[PDB]
């Protein structure tokens, strides 16, 4: 009838808590190199096989939109970008005034300035020598200010600062781990909607591989739905917030620069080097992004079929190309291979659906000064591909966005939209909640300590 | 099986399984600062209730019978619907308003057999 | 800024069905929220009808085999909104009829005990008149 | 489990402190018992939940107390929005169960 309290080590109990998770990187250097903007060395190496607990009789409650393991994934990349441009050089000496001229002029097409010609004066060597020296700028970099002068983009509002031309710009998947006492608990649910009940959980150590590719209005390279198309919004009634869709079967889309660039390396100061690009060795051709017309047709009707879920099984759903912003929010910008594109996805978004091989061209154009997303005066100068660009990727997924006027009309216009690469994390770590475990406990066991 | 495989079984069954759990909560760039701030995260941590678990007397054990009683005012349940019907998170939710009262008690009862048992080497 | 919405004054014969509707604002989904459907009579004090606690309902002893209780998640113009129907209506039934709404995303709350929860959000009356 | 609260009309003036009992039928070790406030014309309110515990945006004023089968609240300092019925509700066991009311008056 009496009892005692026994204290127990190592009981299962948990509850969430946010901490500081660090890397597991399984690509460590094969001996092959080429240290990259992120983990490579400095990431300590993943298991061969990770172990996965299916924890039974469980049903944990996950929020997507509350998760601090994009909070602190967003922050880890901003400052390993950051770690990897203050040792390499600063493009102040090149705020001279440009005496741009067209590369073709009376060449070909309609005199259009793709590229420019600019030749400009600077210090070679001694500082009071400047000899005049000349580079192929493109026309998105050069402002005309009034074989006009021209000036840098950037350069009345952010302070430029060379990429170190050795490290290299492919992602490498990263596996996200906790410390010893804390685990991470992942929603093995198929249809999941991060937000909600999860009635099968399981116990990983830290997460699968996580590509840190940045992207608008379509996420290459992730991870699709198991079986259907999935959409996660905040707030699906809300048009200021966007909405995640998630392919269940990637869409191929193959892009290159079939340019034949060629880097010359201009002397801006000693033992400093600017990048520049000589020539190019061959016709001047456009870049552009290919996607296939039927797969692209299909996978935006399961897209339609899902968006009638949320907005009555009776509506005419059609998208529309990005209205207004910077070139990265209305244009699908990506990196590829060093080189930053931004596509016109005008020929994606051009439908109207009622309820009841071929290939699509994106003419592509590339940056050089690329300035940071949530906003700094600060910018990144790319130094040239010496070569011809091209890769190809997957889609798995877009950010769309709502328009006001969904109070009286029986129409739903969806523009796409990017930016904030929060919604590129959460698009990956979506279904993963960490917790701390507390291992220690008390109960009356009629027990009693032999004195 | 596994770590916290057992965390949607009764007490009862849940409590065979404990070395399972205890035996894994131990295991300068930016990668590095985050790296070496969660191996000192977790000794600290893990050196919390080593000491708390050895003021108490159950130094070197996962399973340690106290000389405190229950009190049946903490929780007035059968021995049987305690440990055959309530998982351990159930359990510490409900027994949440006195662990900082039942904690107080093992240690001021551990020191008390300490001195006793003191007084009675003597004899 | 949750504001539970219900709908108004109604008087019913008696023997019909009612259906009394809760607009959830400012609730983000109703797997993360319980709705429980309280229930006070002209003087009495309040009394529990029935929940849809994780997209499963159920009703108290009373009201078992006689309540209805339904609801919807967030759907691109209209909020969460539950409804209780009330079949074959007696000349006890005229109460004023409460929905209400507890978070149970947290584990540790305290507002909510393993199925049974505090009511921390109430609606504001749909007083029901069944009368001949 | 039925609760059963007491005085059941409870007049008091402004600038005091009150207080409501309550006794369960059987022992709520839990403390599992919160208190809602009804004014008239308005729907019930809310103030403490797990025994004692201040429910967010409630005036620090209210001060709950759990002791196992009698769990009370305490008015301090009382002032003209603290008038009205005031219910007890346990979530120990299914179902949820009210009290039935402390209504609280002006002296004059």
């Known amino acids: 009838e009496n009892l005692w309290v026994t204290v127990y080590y190592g009981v299962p109990v948990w509850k969430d808590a946010e901490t500081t998770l660090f890397c597991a990187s399984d690509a460590k250097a094969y001996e092959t190199e080429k240290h990259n903007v992120w983990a490579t060395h400095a990431c300590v190496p993943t298991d061969p096989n990770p172990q996965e607990i299916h924890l039974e009789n469980v049903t944990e409650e996950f929020n997507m939109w509350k998760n601090n393991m994009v909070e602190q994934m967003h922050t880890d990349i901003i400052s390993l970008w950051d770690q990897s441009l203050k040792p390499c050089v600063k493009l102040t000496p090149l705020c001279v005034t440009l005496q741009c001229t067209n590369v073709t002029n009376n060449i070909t097409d309609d005199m259009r300035g793709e590229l420019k010609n600019c030749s400009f004066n600077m210090t070679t060597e001694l500082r009071d020598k400047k000899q005049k020296v000349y580079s192929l700028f493109y026309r998105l970099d050069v402002v005309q200010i009034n074989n006009k002068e021209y000036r840098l983009i950037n350069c009345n509002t952010s302070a430029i600062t060379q990429a170190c031309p050795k490290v290299s710009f492919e992602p490498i998947p990263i596996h996200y781990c906790a410390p010893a006492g804390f685990a991470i608990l992942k929603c093995k649910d198929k249809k999941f909607n991060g937000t909600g009940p999860c009635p099968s959980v399981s116990t990983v150590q830290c997460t699968h591989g996580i590509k840190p590719v940045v992207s608008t209005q379509l996420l290459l390279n992730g991870s699709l739905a198991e079986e259907e198309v999935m959409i996660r919004s905040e707030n699906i009634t809300n048009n200021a917030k966007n909405i995640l869709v998630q392919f269940n079967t990637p869409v191929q889309i193959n892009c290159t620069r079939p340019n034949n660039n060629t880097r010359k390396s201009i002397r801006i100061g000693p033992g400093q080097a600017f990048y520049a690009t000589g020539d190019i060795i061959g016709d001047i051709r456009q870049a552009h992004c290919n996607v296939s017309k039927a797969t692209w047709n299909e996978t935006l009707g399961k897209v339609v079929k899902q968006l009638r879920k949320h907005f009555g099984n009776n509506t005419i759903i059609r998208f529309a190309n990005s209205s207004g912003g910077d070139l990265e929010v209305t244009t699908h910008s990506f990196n590829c291979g060093g080189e930053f594109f931004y596509c016109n996805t005008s020929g994606l978004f051009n439908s109207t659906w009622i309820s009841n091989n071929d290939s699509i061209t994106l003419p592509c154009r590339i940056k050089q000064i690329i300035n940071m997303w949530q906003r700094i005066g600060q910018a990144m100068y790319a130094p040239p591909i010496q070569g011809v660009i091209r890769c190809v990727s997957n889609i798995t997924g877009l950010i769309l966005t709502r328009d006001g006027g969904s109070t009286n009309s029986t129409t739903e216009t969806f523009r796409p939209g990017g930016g904030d690469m929060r919604d590129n994390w959460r698009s990956e770590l979506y279904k993963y909640k960490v917790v701390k475990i507390e291992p220690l406990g008390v109960a009356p066991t009629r027990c009693k300590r032999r004195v | 099986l596994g770590f916290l495989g057992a965390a949607g079984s009764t007490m009862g069954a849940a409590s065979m399984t404990l070395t399972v759990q205890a035996r894994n909560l131990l295991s300068l760039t930016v990668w590095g600062i985050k790296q070496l701030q969660a191996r000192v995260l977790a000794v600290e941590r893990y050196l919390r209730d080593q000491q708390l678990l050895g003021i108490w007397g159950c130094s070197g054990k996962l399973i340690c019978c106290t000389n405190v009683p229950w009190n049946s005012s903490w929780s007035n349940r059968n021995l049987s619907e305690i440990w055959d019907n309530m998982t351990w998170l159930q359990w510490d939710k409900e027994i949440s308003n006195y662990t900082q009262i039942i904690y107080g008690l093992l240690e001021e009862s551990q020191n008390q057999q300490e001195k006793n048992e003191q007084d009675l080497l003597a004899l | 800024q949750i504001h539970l919405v219900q709908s108004g004054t109604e008087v019913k014969k008696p023997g019909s069905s009612v259906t009394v509707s809760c607009k959830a604002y400012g609730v983000n989904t109703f797997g993360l929220y319980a709705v429980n459907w309280v229930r006070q009579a002209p003087g009495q004090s309040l009394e529990y009808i029935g929940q849809?606690?994780?997209?499963?309902?159920?009703?108290?002893?009373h009201f078992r085999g006689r309540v209805l209780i339904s609801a919807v998640d967030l759907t691109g113009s209209s909020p969460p909104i539950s409804s209780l129907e009330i079949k074959n209506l007696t000349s006890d039934d005229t109460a004023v009829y409460f929905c209400?709404?507890?978070?149970?995303?947290?584990?540790?709350?305290?507002?909510?005990?393993?199925?049974?929860?505090?009511?921390?959000?109430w609606g504001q009356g749909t007083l029901i008149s069944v009368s001949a | 489990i039925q609760m059963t609260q007491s005085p059941s009309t409870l007049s008091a003036s402004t600038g005091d402190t009150v207080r409501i009992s309550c006794r369960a039928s059987?022992?709520?070790?839990?403390?599992?018992v919160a208190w809602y406030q009804q004014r008239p014309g308005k729907a019930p309110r809310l103030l403490i939940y797990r025994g004692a515990a201040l429910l967010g945006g409630v005036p620090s004023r209210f001060r709950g107390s759990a002791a196992g089968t009698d769990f009370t609240l305490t008015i301090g300092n009382l002032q003209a929005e603290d008038f009205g019925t005031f219910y007890c509700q346990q979530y120990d066991t299914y179902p949820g169960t009210f009290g039935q009311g402390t209504k609280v008056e002006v002296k004059r």
């Open positions: 209400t709404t507890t978070s149970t995303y947290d584990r540790w709350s305290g507002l909510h005990h393993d199925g049974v929860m505090a009511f921390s959000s």
């Open positions: 849809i606690w994780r997209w499963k309902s159920s009703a108290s002893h």
């Open positions: 059987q022992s709520i070790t839990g403390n599992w």
